[PDB]
């Protein structure tokens, strides 16, 4: 118990400390690939609809 | 290359070329039953002319077999794991430490075993009293200016040690 | 800089009125002392050096060299007991102070402003060296050794100090500012060709190249480990140190007459690698070694990219902690077995099971791993040089190959296997000689970490 | 912070998940305790540190400089003028080198941004490196090691006057 | 009897240069992690705040870590 | 984004202290090759959870810290990456490693070198881990002959047997 | 007198020390020079250094 | 504590004295002892000895030296720095030498061979090109977004 | 003394079969498809790993009856170039240590 | 049924077929009874310097010291320089050096022709 | 197959070679026979971030496949039928490759053989 305590504790703490603020104050640092958005969605930020695409037929 | 002798024997290279075919048949011919048929079959040709009186007729059979032998052998043998070449061969020499040291210790690691210790330095008075005389006198005394030889006498005069035993006794154990 | 200079002078009376059996305490505390005042000196910034008079100044070239001699100092005067121990106190007292002199010229010589100054230091280094070797050579060559030392280095470095008189006449004064700001380029006559060849041939003899190199092993084999470690690490590196300060004149004829030399240096390190690969006298290895590093460095030189002055002196730096330590692990065997040789002084892991670590971290930091300073020099040396020409690069990457094997083969000839079972005189390894290779090896992960130092002038 | 306007971001484009099917979401239930068990104690860890760093006020100034005139007024030796004349051009040299490795960083940014797409919005960046970049290869590469500032206007008086040569054959 | 004497080469030494160096290499790591972490926790690094006018700052005053 | 990033980065850092426990041990432990074992355990089960979020969302990202010699117009970071191999090969060779010191708890506990194996055994592991991870190629190269010269002591862990060493 | 004051304290001050060699001080200064050319129209790093107002080619 | 009379300059000549001091300060047989001969590459007056010796001298002698195959009192043949156990191995083969060789680099050449009629000859399903929508998936490659809209069409069939 | 009354050996055998029945289709199956996947073979192209495994189980079987046999046939040197390791090892490993340190030691050390 | 076995200067003659074995002379016997002897003689005083209780250091193998100084020092003596070693030390200390500086000749001159005609993939090229 | 015996056996002409595949121009005997759709949509085709080499027909079933599975993800075996789907329109993909490969052989075998042995 206080193995996985420590160790999933007190290195998560360090690095979560470690990842907000010195890391996301560097500017050009962690960086994702964007979540790729589908034609049938709706954007969670601001809110919009994305148009779906069009008839299917001959297949 | 031999300790005791010079030449090994006509007999001793016929009894190698043997075994190491024998060896070596093993080592071709698994399931261990055609094996022994064709280890018998082997036997009844050593057996086929084994009784001639010539000499100079042994030796011609002899090479003769080592060219028929030499073409036939196996490439990878089935040696044992403790022979050269083998898969172990000296695997545990990692652990071999000689005892010429282990008196180089702390004396506090001393006064942890104490009777080894002690029994060790028994020994070692054992070596240190029966060394110089009776060993030295035995190499100096029986041997010509060339010794010819290597095979050591035994100790059988009166009392004590073989000489010439400290590391041969005193080798590790070969499985630490 | 003169707060440098004059403790080294005054840590020399030191050691004659200090009494018997504690000279020794007292040297090393205030050579180590003189170490952390010396890592104060690290404020070079940017546009200009620091100059520290007309007589001193620092380019950033030189300040890690700086620092490597005041702390290769200490730690050679520690490492330089149990073969001197039984002898007198009056011997032992001039040892000391020769090496405490020999400091303050190298000081002297990396702090040079003037390059007449420069050729003045440089063979005033020379001079305790023949000494040092000749009075304590333990062997029956050491005059063979220290007279082609002394020839070798004389005789290629003298008709240096008639061009640099030439230049003194020719063009006003010899600060480097002022031999720079002014410098004009020189064209292919012949006069100037000669000068060339007598400068670099000066520096050529020094560091050494393949043509002129039997003057180091015999200086190292046949000679104590001070000498052998002031010798190759800071004798070499100071001989790569003035040929970068005095390349910066001569600028359109290098490209005319700098052919052959790179050659000679590039067939020369493949043949020294390989030559070293072979060899019995566990000593000599490392000094062919040291021959094929510079050798490298000297292709560094000659090709004239700011990426190959910066791996030409992080290479410096590295092969000098790496070869020095690895002189003084030789060292350290020998005391164990008085031998010389590599066949004989076999086993070494069952016994001694420390010595392994050093044994392994000091192969590992010739072979270069790739943290390391070491790689970080030779992979600046292998971009420029394939800059250079898109053909050479086999021949770096052969001289890695090689240097790989001839190294990790001398690791597992020595160290690996089998003791002899008929040597039963070594003892369990001292906290001295352990110190010694915790002083050479942790400065070098500490530099691997963050190597903004060691980067030179155009960082 | 930063200025966005010389590390620019996009904006942020985050769609809304609609599940399917009820299994439900491992990872919603796990990124909640994450949020409980780290997001919180740091945060408050944080707060605790700033207000210790805000209980007084230290403050670092920019360096700044001023423009001493030129090497191009410079005479024969003038050893106190060429001196301020390359420093100036030495620090004007540094600076064009971290304003390469800025276009260099924007270059990367753009890259792991953009995704699987490398040729969308990226056109643009890439055309300024270029441009950049040209510049630089035509003004600071081929001078070697010894660069005083000397080598760099004899460069430029050789390149000004091949392309002089080259008009005048255009001409 | 089935354990038996098992050999090895002089441990003593071995342990006693490791306690010694990571002693008196932790004898002032200890301390000086302690104060850098006091520092940089209780004393600020500093803020990006302009030239003011009519002012002049010293050598000084131009980096960001205190202890720097 | 918070959980992602920093599950990575104590997937690999987990990965050091064990070294921190030889160096600082001065006082020899005898279940060793339980922490290892149990700290390759932690290491698996905290990655299988953002190779779970990459499947689930997608999100790849790249982290990029500590610059050393940012010299000419390039510049060096301690940089990795997780992608799609990048994540996808990690928690299978975490397992695979987890059953090896299951294994080499077993095979090799009559042999009383077994503290340094697992300590050359768990670098090893280091290195390709660093090795698959990294974006910068430098970093590459750096987990390239790491893995080389543990490859080199591994294969010659039985001192002896010149077979070995050759 | 060689590791308790030397190693760690030499670690700590070649830690970290002023910008060596003007590192720190080109990040911001080139950040602040990028954000001025790029708002004000012209091209970052305008090529020939040297301004031709103020040169003087020998005529051929 | 060393004779300077137990190293060796000079060859062989003459042939009574100086063969005879070899023989005794090499420990050797007269007859066997054997000179280069002086060719000039230096090599003193060192014997020569059958020069393979070290994949024979049969391991179970038990001499002194285990992992050397030294006896003490060998001449130690001058190449031994290449000649111990890890560096070559001058084993008697199974086979032969030239015959292994001749099998070899024929086997290369005709993988070889074999895969150049290959790279002229290759294989192919009956399937024409991939059809890409817009303009052979133009905007996606190198780019140029209004210099080059070149057209081209696909047509079912 | 053979001997699996043993926790973790078979726990660790068990812990990789458990592996290697499951995970290389939990693994090979919920990835994104980076590629076009063909799909569209005749017959005698999808069928032919099948039909190579099977024939060469064939062949191996009446192989391993062969060996059940007792006739001890001689080798054909295509035994050897299949037994020694192929004959790259010794070829140039019998070479090239040979033909480097031949030339280390006239050339470059004498 | 035999290839004869030919040897190379890589593949040794075993013990078994030399065929030279099988007809023996008595000086041959007589020459194996005394390399018996010297291996012998050799063997006992290594011995005997081997088992000394009061010995501490090494045993001060004369032949490997004697072979040291062969291969190290007594090189140069003895040497004369023959028209055999002349030509082979100018074909292996210049010939490949003069070879490898004809080439990088040829690389340096078709690259900087190139670069003056400008037809290069330098268009960044920055890191030189 | 056979048609690699046929064109490494016979003659040069009538077995056409491939990645050089227009020779003879299309609308030969197509009169006004056209559709390609294309019903995609490529700024939302490019708004999902697919792979080159993929923006091809027979894609918006493979944006409907990556919804399906992005929207239900711990079910592990969720979508069957649109991924079966998007396997059958690429097979109708392969199946108009084909038939464009055996048009333009008839068309070069009948074509040329007419014209080289009437000419
Ligand atoms: C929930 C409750 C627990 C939460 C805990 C989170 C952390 C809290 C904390 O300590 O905050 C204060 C503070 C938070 O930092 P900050 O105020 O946001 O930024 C300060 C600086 O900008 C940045 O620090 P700096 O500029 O002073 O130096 C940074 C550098 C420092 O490294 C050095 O200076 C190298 C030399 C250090 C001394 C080595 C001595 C010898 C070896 C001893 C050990 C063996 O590297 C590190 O500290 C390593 C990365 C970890 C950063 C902190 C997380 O933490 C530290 O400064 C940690 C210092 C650690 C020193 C090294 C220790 C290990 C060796
Ligand atoms: C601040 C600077 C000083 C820090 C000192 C920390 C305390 C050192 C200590 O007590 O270590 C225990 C350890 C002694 O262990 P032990 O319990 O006495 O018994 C181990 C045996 O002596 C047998 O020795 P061993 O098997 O431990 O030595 C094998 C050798 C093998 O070398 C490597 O593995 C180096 C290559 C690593 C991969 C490169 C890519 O070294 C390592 O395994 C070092 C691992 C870390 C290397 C990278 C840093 O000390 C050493 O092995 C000596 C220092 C090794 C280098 C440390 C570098 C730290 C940075
Ligand atoms: C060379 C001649 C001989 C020199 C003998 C003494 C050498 C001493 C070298 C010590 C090097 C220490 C480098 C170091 O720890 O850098 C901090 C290193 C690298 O950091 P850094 O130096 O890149 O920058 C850190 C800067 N601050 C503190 C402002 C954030 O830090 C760590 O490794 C973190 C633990
Ligand atoms: C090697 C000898 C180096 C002598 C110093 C270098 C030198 O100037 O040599 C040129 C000298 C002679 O050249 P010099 O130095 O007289 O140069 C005269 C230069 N002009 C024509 C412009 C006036 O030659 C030698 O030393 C020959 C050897
Ligand atoms: C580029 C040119 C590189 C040249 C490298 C020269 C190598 C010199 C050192 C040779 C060496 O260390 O040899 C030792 C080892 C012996 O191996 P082996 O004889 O097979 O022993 C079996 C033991 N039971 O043998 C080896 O380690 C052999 C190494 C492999 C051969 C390398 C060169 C041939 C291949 C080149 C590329 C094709």
Not at chain 2, 49 to 56: A, L, P, T
Not at chain 6, 3 to 29: G, Q, R, W, Y
Request: with cysteine.
């Amino acid at each position: 118990s206080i193995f996985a305590f420590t160790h999933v504790l007190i290195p998560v703490w360090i690095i979560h400390y470690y990842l907000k603020y010195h890391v996301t104050t560097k500017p050009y640092t962690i960086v994702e690939k964007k979540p790729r958005i589908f034609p049938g969605d709706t954007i969670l930020e601001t809110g919009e609809v994305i148009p779906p695409m069009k008839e299917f037929p001959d297949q | 290359f031999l300790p005791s002798a010079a030449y090994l024997t006509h007999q001793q290279k016929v009894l190698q070329l043997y075994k190491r075919a024998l060896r070596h048949l093993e080592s071709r011919c698994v399931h261990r039953d055609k094996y022994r048929y064709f280890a018998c079959l082997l036997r009844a040709r050593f057996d086929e002319h084994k009784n001639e009186k010539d000499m100079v007729k042994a030796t011609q059979l002899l090479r003769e077999a080592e060219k028929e032998f030499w073409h036939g052998q196996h490439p990878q043998p089935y040696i044992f794991p403790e022979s050269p070449g083998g898969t172990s061969y000296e695997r545990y020499e990692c652990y071999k430490v000689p005892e010429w040291c282990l008196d180089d210790w702390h004396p506090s690691e001393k006064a942890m075993y104490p009777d080894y210790f002690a029994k060790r330095e028994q020994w070692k008075k054992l070596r240190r009293e029966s060394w110089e005389r009776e060993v030295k006198q035995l190499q100096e005394e029986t041997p010509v200016g060339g010794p010819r030889t290597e095979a050591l006498p035994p100790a059988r005069k009166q009392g004590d040690l073989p000489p010439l035993w400290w590391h041969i006794v005193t080798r590790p154990r070969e499985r630490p | 800089m003169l707060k440098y200079i004059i403790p080294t002078m005054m840590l020399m009376p030191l050691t004659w009125l200090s009494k018997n059996s504690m000279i020794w305490i007292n040297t090393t505390l205030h050579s180590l002392l003189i170490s952390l005042t010396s890592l104060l000196l690290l404020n070079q910034f940017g546009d200009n050096s620091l100059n520290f008079s007309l007589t001193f100044f620092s380019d950033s070239l030189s300040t890690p060299l700086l620092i490597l001699t005041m702390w290769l100092l200490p730690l050679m005067l520690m490492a330089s007991q149990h073969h001197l121990s039984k002898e007198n106190l009056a011997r032992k007292k001039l040892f000391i102070s020769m090496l405490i002199l020999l400091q303050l010229f190298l000081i002297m010589t990396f702090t040079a402003t003037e390059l007449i100054f420069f050729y003045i230091m440089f063979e005033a280094t020379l001079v305790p060296t023949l000494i040092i070797i000749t009075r304590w050579g333990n062997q029956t060559e050491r005059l063979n050794a220290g007279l082609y030392f002394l020839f070798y280095t004389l005789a290629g470095s003298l008709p240096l100090l008639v061009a640099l008189i030439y230049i003194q006449n020719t063009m006003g004064s010899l600060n480097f500012l002022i031999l720079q700001y002014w410098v004009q380029p020189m064209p292919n006559s012949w006069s100037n060709t000669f000068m060339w060849l007598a400068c670099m041939m000066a520096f050529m003899v020094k560091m050494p190249l393949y043509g002129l190199h039997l003057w180091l092993p015999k200086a190292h084999v046949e000679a104590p480990i001070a000498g052998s470690m002031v010798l190759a690490a800071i004798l070499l590196k100071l001989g790569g140190y003035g040929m970068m300060r005095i390349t910066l004149l001569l600028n359109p004829i290098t490209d005319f007459m700098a052919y052959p030399f790179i050659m000679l240096s590039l067939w020369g390190m493949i043949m020294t690698s390989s030559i070293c690969l072979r060899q019995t006298d566990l000593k000599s290895l490392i000094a062919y070694s040291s021959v094929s590093h510079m050798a490298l460095v000297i292709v560094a030189i000659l090709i004239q990219t700011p990426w190959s002055y910066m791996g030409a002196t992080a290479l410096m730096i590295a092969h000098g902690l790496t070869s020095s330590m690895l002189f003084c692990l030789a060292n350290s065997n020998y005391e164990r077995v008085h031998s010389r040789t590599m066949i004989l002084a076999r086993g070494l892991q069952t016994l001694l099971p420390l010595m392994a670590a050093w044994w392994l971290l000091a192969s590992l930091t010739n072979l270069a791993l790739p943290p390391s300073i070491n790689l970080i020099g030779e992979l600046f040396v292998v971009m420029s040089t394939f800059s250079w020409s898109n053909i050479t690069i086999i021949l770096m990457g052969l001289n890695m190959v090689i240097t790989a094997l001839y190294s990790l083969y001398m690791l597992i000839t020595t160290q690996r296997g089998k003791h002899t079972h008929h040597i039963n005189n070594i003892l369990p390894s001292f906290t001295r000689e352990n110190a010694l290779m915790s002083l050479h090896m942790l400065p070098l992960l500490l530099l691997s970490l963050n190597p903004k130092i060691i980067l030179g002038p155009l960082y | 912070s930063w200025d966005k306007d010389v590390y620019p971001e996009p904006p942020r484009r985050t769609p809304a998940p609609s599940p399917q099917t009820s299994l439900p979401n491992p990872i919603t239930y796990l990124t909640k305790a994450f949020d409980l068990l780290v997001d919180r104690p740091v945060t408050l860890v944080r707060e605790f540190i700033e207000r210790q760093h805000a209980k007084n006020k230290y403050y670092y100034y920019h360096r700044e400089f001023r423009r001493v005139p030129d090497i191009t007024e410079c005479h024969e030796k003038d050893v106190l003028c060429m001196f301020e004349a390359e420093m100036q051009w030495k620090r004007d040299y540094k600076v064009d080198q971290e304003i390469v490795n800025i276009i260099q960083e924007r270059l990367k940014a753009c890259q792991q941004r953009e995704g699987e797409s490398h040729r969308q919005n990226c056109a643009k960046e890439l055309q300024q490196f270029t441009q950049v970049v040209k510049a630089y290869q035509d003004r600071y590469h081929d001078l070697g090691a010894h660069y005083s500032a000397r080598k760099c206007l004899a460069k430029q008086k050789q390149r000004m006057l091949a392309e002089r040569k080259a008009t005048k054959e255009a001409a | 009897g089935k354990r038996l004497f098992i050999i090895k080469p002089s441990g003593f030494y071995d342990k006693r240069f490791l306690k010694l160096l990571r002693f008196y290499i932790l004898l002032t790591g200890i301390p000086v992690v302690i104060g850098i972490t006091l520092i940089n926790v209780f004393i600020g690094e500093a803020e990006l705040a302009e030239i003011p006018e009519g002012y002049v700052p010293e050598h000084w005053e131009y980096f960001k870590h205190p202890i720097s | 984004m918070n959980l992602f990033s920093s599950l990575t980065l104590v997937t690999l850092i987990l990965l050091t202290m064990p070294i921190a426990a030889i160096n600082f041990n001065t006082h020899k432990f005898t279940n060793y090759p339980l922490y290892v074992k149990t700290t390759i355990s932690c290491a698996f089960i905290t990655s299988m959870i953002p190779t779970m979020m990459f499947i689930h969302t997608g999100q790849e990202m790249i982290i990029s810290n500590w610059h050393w010699l940012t010299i000419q117009t390039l510049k060096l970071s301690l940089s990795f990456k997780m992608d799609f191999f990048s994540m996808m090969f990690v928690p299978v060779a975490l397992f695979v490693t987890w059953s090896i010191m299951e294994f080499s708890m077993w095979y090799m506990h009559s042999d009383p070198n077994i503290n340094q194996f697992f300590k050359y055994l768990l670098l090893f592991l280091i290195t390709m881990l660093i090795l698959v991870t990294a974006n910068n190629l430098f970093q590459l190269f750096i987990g390239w002959e790491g893995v080389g010269i543990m490859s080199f002591l591994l294969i010659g862990w039985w001192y002896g047997r010149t077979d070995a060493n050759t | 007198f060689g590791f308790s004051i030397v190693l760690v304290l030499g670690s700590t001050f070649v830690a970290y020390l002023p910008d060596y060699r003007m590192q720190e001080w080109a990040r911001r200064e080139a950040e602040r020079l990028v954000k001025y050319r790029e708002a004000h129209g012209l091209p970052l790093m305008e090529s020939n250094c040297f301004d031709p107002s103020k040169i003087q080619l020998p005529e051929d | 504590s060393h004779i300077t009379k137990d190293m060796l300059p000079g060859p062989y000549p003459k042939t009574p004295e100086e063969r005879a001091a070899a023989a005794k300060k090499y420990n050797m047989r007269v007859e066997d002892y054997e000179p280069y001969p002086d060719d000039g590459m230096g090599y003193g007056d060192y014997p020569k000895l059958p020069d393979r010796s070290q994949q024979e001298r049969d391991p179970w002698y038990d001499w002194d030296h285990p992992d050397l195959r030294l006896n003490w009192g060998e001449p130690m043949h001058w190449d031994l720095d290449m000649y111990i156990r890890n560096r070559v191995d001058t084993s008697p083969t199974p086979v032969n030498w030239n015959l292994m060789c001749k099998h070899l680099f024929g086997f290369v050449a005709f993988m070889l061979f074999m895969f150049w009629v290959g790279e002229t000859y290759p294989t192919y399903q009956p399937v024409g090109p991939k059809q890409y929508p817009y303009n052979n998936l133009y905007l996606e490659r190198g780019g140029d977004p209004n210099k080059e809209p070149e057209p081209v069409v696909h047509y079912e069939i | 003394n053979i001997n699996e009354n043993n926790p973790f050996l078979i726990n660790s055998i068990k812990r990789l079969l458990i592996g290697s029945l499951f995970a290389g289709f939990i693994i090979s199956n919920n990835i994104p498809p980076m590629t076009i996947p063909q799909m569209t073979m005749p017959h005698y192209l999808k069928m032919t790993a099948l039909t190579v495994t099977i024939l060469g189980f064939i062949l191996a079987l009446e192989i391993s009856n062969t060996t059940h046999y007792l006739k001890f046939n001689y080798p054909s040197n295509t035994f050897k170039f299949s037994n020694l390791l192929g004959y790259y090892p010794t070829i140039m490993h019998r070479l090239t240590p040979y033909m480097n340190l031949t030339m280390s030691q006239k050339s470059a050390s004498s | 049924s035999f290839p004869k076995y030919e040897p190379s200067r890589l593949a040794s003659l075993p013990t078994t077929l030399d065929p030279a074995e099988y007809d023996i002379s008595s000086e041959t016997r007589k020459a194996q009874a005394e390399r018996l002897a010297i291996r012998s003689r050799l063997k006992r005083e290594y011995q005997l310097q081997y088992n000394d209780p009061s010995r501490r250091g090494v045993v001060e193998d004369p032949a490997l010291i004697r072979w040291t100084c062969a291969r190290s020092a007594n090189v140069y003596p003895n040497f004369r320089p023959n028209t055999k070693t002349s030509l082979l030390g100018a074909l292996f200390g210049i010939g490949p050096l003069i070879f490898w500086y004809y080439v990088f000749k040829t690389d340096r001159d078709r690259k900087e022709k190139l670069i003056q005609e400008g037809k290069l993939d330098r268009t960044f090229n920055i890191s030189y | 197959g056979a048609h690699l015996a046929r064109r490494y056996l016979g003659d040069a002409s009538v077995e056409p070679e491939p990645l050089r595949m227009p020779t003879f121009p299309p609308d030969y005997g197509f009169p006004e026979r056209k559709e390609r759709e294309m019903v995609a949509t490529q700024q939302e085709m490019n708004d999902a971030q697919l792979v080159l080499q993929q923006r091809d027909y027979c894609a918006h079933y493979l944006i409907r496949f990556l919804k399906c599975k992005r929207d239900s993800f711990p079910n592990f075996l969720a979508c069957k039928h649109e991924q079966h789907d998007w396997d059958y329109c690429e097979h109708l993909d392969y199946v108009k490759r084909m038939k464009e490969f055996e048009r333009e052989r008839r068309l070069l075998q009948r074509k040329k053989r007419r014209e080289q042995r009437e000419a």
